[PDB]
Amino acid sequence: PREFVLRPAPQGRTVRCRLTRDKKGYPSYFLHLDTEKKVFLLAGRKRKRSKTANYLISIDPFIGKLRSNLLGNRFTVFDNGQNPQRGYSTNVASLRQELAAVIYETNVLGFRGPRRMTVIIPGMSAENERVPIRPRNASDGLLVRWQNKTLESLIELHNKPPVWNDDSGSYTLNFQGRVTQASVKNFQIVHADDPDYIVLQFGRVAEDAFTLDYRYPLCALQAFAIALSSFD
Amino acid sequence: PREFVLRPAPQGRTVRCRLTRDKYPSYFLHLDTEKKVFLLAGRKRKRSKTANYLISIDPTNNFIGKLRSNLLGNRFTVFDNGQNPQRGYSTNVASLRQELAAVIYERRMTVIIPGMSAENERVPIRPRNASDGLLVRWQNKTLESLIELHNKPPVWNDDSGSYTLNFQGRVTQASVKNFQIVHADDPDYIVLQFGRVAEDAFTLDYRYPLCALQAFAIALSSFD
Numbered sequence A: 001p002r003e004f005v006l007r008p009a010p011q012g013r014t015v016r017c018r019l020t021r022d023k024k025g026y027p028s029y030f031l032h033l034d035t036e037k038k039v040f041l042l043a044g045r046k047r048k049r050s051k052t053a054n055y056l057i058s059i060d061p062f063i064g065k066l067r068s069n070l071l072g073n074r075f076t077v078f079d080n081g082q083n084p085q086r087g088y089s090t091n092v093a094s095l096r097q098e099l100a101a102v103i104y105e106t107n108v109l110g111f112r113g114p115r116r117m118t119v120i121i122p123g124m125s126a127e128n129e130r131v132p133i134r135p136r137n138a139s140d141g142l143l144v145r146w147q148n149k150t151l152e153s154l155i156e157l158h159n160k161p162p163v164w165n166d167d168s169g170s171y172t173l174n175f176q177g178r179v180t181q182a183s184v185k186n187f188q189i190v191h192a193d194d195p196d197y198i199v200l201q202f203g204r205v206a207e208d209a210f211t212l213d214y215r216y217p218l219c220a221l222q223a224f225a226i227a228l229s230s231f232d
Numbered sequence B: 001p002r003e004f005v006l007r008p009a010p011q012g013r014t015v016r017c018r019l020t021r022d023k024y025p026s027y028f029l030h031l032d033t034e035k036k037v038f039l040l041a042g043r044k045r046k047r048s049k050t051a052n053y054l055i056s057i058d059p060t061n062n063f064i065g066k067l068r069s070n071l072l073g074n075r076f077t078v079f080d081n082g083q084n085p086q087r088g089y090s091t092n093v094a095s096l097r098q099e100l101a102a103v104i105y106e107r108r109m110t111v112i113i114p115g116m117s118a119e120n121e122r123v124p125i126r127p128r129n130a131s132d133g134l135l136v137r138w139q140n141k142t143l144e145s146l147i148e149l150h151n152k153p154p155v156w157n158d159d160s161g162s163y164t165l166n167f168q169g170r171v172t173q174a175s176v177k178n179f180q181i182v183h184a185d186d187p188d189y190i191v192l193q194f195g196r197v198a199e200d201a202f203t204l205d206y207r208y209p210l211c212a213l214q215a216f217a218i219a220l221s222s223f224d
């Protein structure tokens, strides 16, 4: 379970998942595989006493964290490690890794939704594993590298804008059956160099259910945390 | 009213006011509604070494804060109505003044405010001496407890044939004094807008995390 949720998806496959929100009575979110045994993967929920959004992610309904800025438009996904700012003598191997960053900006072009999203993730090795990014302090990290435009050995991804349908008068994307309700928060994330390889897809299927389907190089923790950053 | 003017604006809303000047001139802030509703009054003291505005919730006289310039006249601090610690050090801590905002002019403007708690209230900054304060922290680059804001640069508009911003109808007159204050991370969330609509009338519209006293004092700092 712990190993599965951190492993990049096998090459050539799509890992298809159901994400459920529980708003009864902050809301709880759950990820399960979208089979008919529906194995539990991940739970997430916002911490109560927190100044900005902080979701704690676990494999019991503690494996990572999603942290927001105050403006609610720049996110980092961490693993379970320690924050270097809390003590400089902390063992380097125990410091938290940055698994993803997510940047939301308002669109300058019309006809592709209110928001653009950029996803920065670590690069991959020859053995198809992540090359970890494990900052020793403030001055480095995925969002900092994005801001300084130093994305050298990182992977950058964006939301796919919808395409004018040729005879039928729509800006659309083919979600391959994984959307049941139209929603401004449905999305496909792609690499700019291949618009047809859908690295992450998030689709609404009911009031509190969504599809979440991921491919290499993402793992479930990264996929889940990126989907969570899309909620208000 | 004393509560209202210190309360951060409700999240998701914009509090729309009208600022007027009686032309040392007097300044007045009203809610921008069909019936005027009074919020704040301010006036420069005549006999200060540097610029000092007193701010009240009574336009006839309820003392609520102050706006104090530095020596050069390019940096300002906004205080609530508490005591200055330099005047009496045995003074109870709960009675000492708090720093609500600071403004630095180069015009390019930098606005520094206290940060907010998990309950959406200010984390107060209440120095015991002048080794601490908004401007001290900002100049030492220790901004963890604070929020840093700047005026938004104007952009080319083809229609108008000028560098301007979309003030949404709230400006009628072009002016060097017209501004929008934003955070670096989001140029579209307008924390404070100030705009001219006549010779001695302006709009002043604020959003969370600001309260009216921070908003009005920030605007007063832009005059001289």
Ligand SMILES: CCCCCCCC[N+](C)(C)CCCS(=O)(=O)[O-]
Binding pocket: A070, A071, A072, A073, B011, B012, B013, B147, B183, B189, B191, B208, B209
């Ligand atoms: C400079 C501090 C601003 C405080 C954060 C405000 C949060 C803004 N959002 C992302 C939660 C949305 C703004 C509210 S809206 O949608 O009504 O403009």
